[model samples]
Target: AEDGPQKQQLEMPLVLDQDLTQQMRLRVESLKQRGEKKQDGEKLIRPAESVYRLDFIQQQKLQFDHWNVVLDKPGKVTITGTSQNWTPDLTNLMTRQLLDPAAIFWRKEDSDAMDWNEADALEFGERLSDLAKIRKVMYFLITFGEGVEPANLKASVVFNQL
Candidate 1:
């Protein structure tokens, strides 16, 4: 005996717009046409199996420019731009599998903010670590409140092997 729906589920079609780059547009088009391959009398291949993960990663790393954050308030901010940056590359991978899209928004000052909000951070961190694969990342210069040095500070990352 089984519980829950037994039928195979389908992902909703994603729409492409002019804002997407030609490369991304083509990828989305391929995603839309998933499941009709001319093999073994025209069999169906799942989208996940066909999506080009390697090419996407290469494109992301090569085209990454910068990360721009807009701080509208003291503790709240939003990512205001996108054009193949480090954060954006990780974010796209976050949406692909083993993570939730909503968990991408990170807050540093909530009462329980130190605690992990969900699987998103873990997934992203793990993937990043694996991608780095031995490089130790450390130190970033950050500007806050109109580049006032008194209020701004330096950010760094510490690594612990366990």
Candidate 2:
């Protein structure tokens, strides 16, 4: 009766479990498709993904978008883009430039930022930790300029183990 007596009940309480966290690392990534490309201006090819309280991203690959055959010829595509971390308010982040079709990566604060620890790191960590009251999220947009349709290219981003 314990299992069957509630047949008429429509409200069921959630039975929370920790298995989801014990399972595996979450992979969060945004890929670029032909549909994401636009003509001659800056726009998002890589979009946003939501995150969690202690989410840590492992690897990120920012690569140039490979395009249709330039049966149209040596259509030179010279470009630049800024890799960033975004929040409720938009901010300008580390911007990198490239001349050829290759991959470059990593996102950081500004010219002075690097991975090493500074004494103030603990202070910044605590200040930012306030946002952890709820599971969270971060964002980025891939904005760049291109030449023609062939140069109407896009770049791809791969993020894993967040």
Candidate 3:
């Protein structure tokens, strides 16, 4: 069951994990066989496995997908993802492994440049605490409007302890 990520990391030449690694492999393989040139800031290892869990969204909501990547070491298992709206429920979903990737999307508010307050950040922090293993996180986000560079996407990475 767990041999995916563990084996890919140790045995594979590049990077590999159970959920994320396998997904990436399938995606990459579907592309041309010429070879792959690392993109700018593209996570070589899908961010730190010790940080937040990884998931893919379908729409514009914070719903979980069928597949996700979990980094569970001796002490903690960090999870991470990206989105327009930041909510505590997101962290809870990661902790419970109840992700629906179809629900994730960049909200209109974010595209409208909605300002975030300290309370919002704090609320997100609180929801994150539910996962005892989670400690820190970083999100990479992009505005949802015209002239926005698709390359300028959003993301968040985190770290935690057991």
Candidate 4:
């Protein structure tokens, strides 16, 4: 019996389609910045970053999971990324079309993974720093991709104030 796509297939199509169609249609040049300092160290502009999410019908489903700091880690602030294969690829040009193995095809996992890193050196953005004088940290960091709809990039609040 030819099933009309398993429930699993349901999500894979849209997700990967989003991955394929969506990604293949954006970005500019590779000779630009990764937009690493946007709105204060947040979001990655495509054609600059060789990173994209994967969930498809091929080699597993590339997966990337990042955590927002509930209370902030010392060495890293809200600027740490957990995306696999964070290294730059000379060919991709941050484009959606990849010829090399720099995608997240881990339906379960992709080995030899690389994680993006950013040592949070926040400016006066947190100068009023003090547990006693602090209120709450409100916004923060990203891994970058096809679409930019992360609830935080636009705006939020934090413990420190001006």
Give the per-residue lDDT digits (tens) of candidate 4, residues 1-162.
Answer: 353323232112111123422332343322234543223232334332322232222322322122122211111112211223223232222223222221121111243322323222232222213211222211111233333223212211122111
Q: Candidate 3's residue-wise lDDT over 57-157, tens digit each?
A: 11122211122212121111222334323343332112223221211222243253322333434444344334322332323221223323223333332
Better of 3 and 4 by lDDT: 3
lDDT of 1 by residue, 1-162 (tens): 353345332211111122323333354456558843332322122222211111121211221111122222234211111112223222332222222221122225334232223354344333433433322221111212222221222111122222
Number of the candidate with higher lDDT, 2 or 4: 4
**Candidate 3 local distance difference test against the native:** 0.29
**lDDT of candidate 1 at residue 44, scale 0 to 100:** 23
**Which candidate number has the best TM-score?**
1
Clash pairs (backbone) in predicted model 2: none
- At residue 25, candidate 3 shows an lDDT of 46
Report how far off residue 118 is in candidate 2 (Å): 34
Error of 2 at 61 (Å): 12
Model 1 scores a TM of 0.24
TM per candidate comes to 0.24, 0.19, 0.23, 0.18
User: Best-fitting candidate, measured by lDDT?
Assistant: 3
Supply the global lDDT for candidate 4. 0.25
Descending-TM-score candidate ranking: 1, 3, 2, 4
lDDT of 3 at 59: 16
